[PDB]
């Protein structure tokens, strides 16, 4: 018997198929997070600015209180 190269089929590798698929973000869903992060962003930032006003008047008060300076 003579032995040569043998053939293999099984699944035939599956040639030409789109492996690319959309993931995580769809379109409308990411905009709700996007503007949602903005709405949370400005609201939390301005609370510290109002807290800065408590310091702002009190810091400049030191110059008014000190006249022997």
């Amino acid at each position: 018997x003579x032995x040569x190269x043998x053939x293999x089929x099984x699944x035939x590798x599956x040639x030409x198929x789109x492996x690319x698929x959309x993931x995580x973000x769809x379109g409308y869903s990411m905009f709700a997070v996007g503007i949602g992060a903005l709405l949370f962003g400005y609201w939390s930032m301005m609370k510290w600015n109002r807290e800065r006003r408590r310091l702002q008047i009190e810091d400049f008060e030191a110059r008014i209180a000190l006249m022997p300076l």
């Binding site: 190269x5 293999x8 590798x13």
Partner: protein, 53 residues
């Protein structure tokens, strides 16, 4: 990136050339008498395994 993404694949590809003929790149494998030398037993198992991935 894409240059080194496929050159690891390409260096694996030259192994098929090396196993079929003694040279890396250019081989006198194709001749007017059809084909010079037979496919070894350790190639047909490798081509199918390579194409699947």
């Amino acid at each position: 990136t894409p240059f080194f993404w496929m050159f690891e694949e390409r260096e694996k590809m030259f192994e098929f050339y090396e196993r079929v003929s003694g040279a890396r790149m250019h081989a006198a494998y194709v001749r007017p008498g059809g084909v010079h030398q037979d496919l070894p037993l350790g190639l047909m198992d490798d081509i199918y395994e390579f194409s699947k991935n």
